[PDB]
């Protein structure tokens, strides 16, 4: 198969990788393997260092400087390749040994091992006035040579490659999420029943979403409007908990319910970025430099460990609301609306052989 490589502006260094995407099965992560080409003849520092870093580069608002973004590291691990440390004895993968054979005796291998329970590749959608780098969580690998770790690094004496950490939808689905609500009033003891149910908790991006709803009206009021929506829930862990929501698509039904009568119907919604381009700050999946990606796929945490995961955690919900006519003794003072929330999960199916690539119809 073919591989990826890049050289320093000096041309002395070149690094080779098998891929840019790394699958995490939550419990374990695929090891990151690679080989670097070195030129010790002109290299007087006698030491070579590579680093994989998980940092939260972020833009700054109060600083009037355009383009300046602050970067907060979350996980940094570095391994030295040259000189070959006798302690860092590791086996080489099937491709890694072939690459060593091809390049020869002037190439050295390396391997990082990411600990689990770490944030995935996520990107925040930039505003129309944004000209800096991307905002979100992104991995990168930096390779360089220096006499000491604390030595000042040169731009010609380092490289930077971006990699992505994504998940895939598990094969075994769970039960169908169904939710019901019951509202009671003061004038009469007749309850207000509501049922909501989706087709299956697992969907693919761009597929229609169908929900089953049933209404049992028993009071003397009349239902005016029914609001159906799905919103994006974003959990942010930088210094504290940050909670906010943003709808992706809303549908309004003009159904009316007579007092002491029932109703049932099914509706369909579809999320897509085309009509939500102007909605600033939306969560999007990993980007390399500027490639247009889908909406951020749902992140699956590691069971109920109750861990306080750093970075960004994404989730989705289904919101159904009922508009109830006002008036009477309380007039327009009460709040008689009824609502319900349905969570669900959305990822990508497991790829067979072809990894996703960068905007196939290039212009």
């Amino acid at each position, epitope marked *: 198969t073919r591989v990826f490589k890049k050289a320093s502006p000096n041309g002395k260094l070149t690094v080779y990788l098998g891929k840019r995407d790394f699958v995490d099965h939550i419990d374990l992560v695929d090891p990151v393997d690679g080989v670097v080409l070195v030129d010790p003849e002109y290299l007087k520092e006698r030491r070579v260092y590579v680093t994989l870093t998980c940092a939260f580069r972020y833009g700054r608002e109060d600083l009037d400087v355009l383009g300046l973004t602050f970067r907060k590291d979350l996980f940094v691990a570095n391994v030295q390749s040259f000189p070959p440390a006798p302690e860092d004895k590791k086996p080489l993968t099937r491709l890694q040994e072939r690459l060593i054979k091809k390049l020869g005796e002037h190439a050295y291998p390396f391997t990082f091992e990411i600990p689990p329970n770490l944030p995935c590749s996520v990107t925040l959608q930039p505003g129309p006035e944004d000209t800096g780098k991307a905002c979100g969580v992104d991995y990168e690998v930096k390779a360089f040579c220096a006499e000491n770790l604390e030595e000042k690094i040169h731009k010609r004496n380092s490289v930077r490659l971006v990699i992505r950490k994504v998940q895939y939808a598990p094969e075994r689905p769970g039960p169908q999420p169904t939710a019901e609500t019951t509202r009671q009033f003061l004038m009469s003891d007749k309850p207000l029943h509501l049922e909501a149910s989706l087709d299956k908790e697992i969907y693919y991006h761009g597929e*229609p979403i169908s929900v089953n709803v049933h209404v049992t009206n028993n009071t003397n009021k009349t239902v005016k409007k029914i609001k159906i929506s799905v919103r994006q829930y974003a959990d942010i862990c930088l210094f504290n908990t940050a909670q906010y929501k943003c709808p992706v698509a809303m549908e309004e039904a003009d159904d009316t319910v007579a007092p002491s009568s029932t109703f049932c119907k099914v509706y369909t919604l*579809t999320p897509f970025l*085309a009509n939500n381009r102007e909605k600033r700050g939306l969560a999007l999946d990993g980007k390399l430099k500027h490639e247009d990606t889908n909406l951020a796929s749902s992140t699956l945490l590691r069971e109920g460990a109750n861990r306080e995961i750093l970075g960004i955690i994404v989730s989705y919900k289904v919101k159904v609301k009922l508009v109830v006519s006002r008036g009477g003794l309380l007039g327009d003072l009460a709040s008689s609306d009824v609502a319900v929330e349905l969570p669900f999960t959305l990822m*990508h199916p497991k790829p067979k052989e*072809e990894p*996703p690539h960068r905007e196939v*119809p*290039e212009s």
Partner: antibody
Amino acid sequence: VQLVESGGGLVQPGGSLRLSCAASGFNVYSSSIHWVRQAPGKGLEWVASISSYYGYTYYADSVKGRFTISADTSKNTAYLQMNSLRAEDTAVYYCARSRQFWYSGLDYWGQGTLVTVSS
Amino acid sequence: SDIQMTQSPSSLSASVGDRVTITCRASQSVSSAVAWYQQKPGKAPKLLIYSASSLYSGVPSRFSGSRSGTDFTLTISSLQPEDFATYYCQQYKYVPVTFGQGTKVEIKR
């Protein structure tokens, strides 16, 4: 999964026509639709494409300014706009469907329709 | 930018069971974003290989392909009687989508 097209015919040069591509078994939000032509005795040739998710439109240079594409999400059917037709543009037209996540070639093809542009 | 592909040879004839090959060239680097199609006379084209190396589902294994730099190759091991049709090489890296001329395959007499 069956792709059906209709609307071809014989029209005098410079006119317009309606090409509707009726897709079944799948939605348009998850697929990208493309149009390809092949002149009699010639090879195939892509003319247009549409992207429902990204809302992006692409057209060939030879057919720029005179051709437009459209799609209706209500019933998974797309319409093709052509104006100021040329006699040389007569060919056999095909509507095709491709996976949007991701591009893997043109697996699904229509039955093909014949258009004649002559006075 | 536009990409021009020249398929060679234009056409050939061969007997049943022969090993035949075709060459697909590129005007620029195209990586492996290349596919192939076969069209029977009077019908819609049929996809055979995508990514220049990956067979489609449900295809006989006699079909085969290869890649070598800017030159791409598709090869057939055994010629079944129904394999006599027209074939095309297609790349999908840069717009516009530019098709080739095509090769007609016919029996030998």
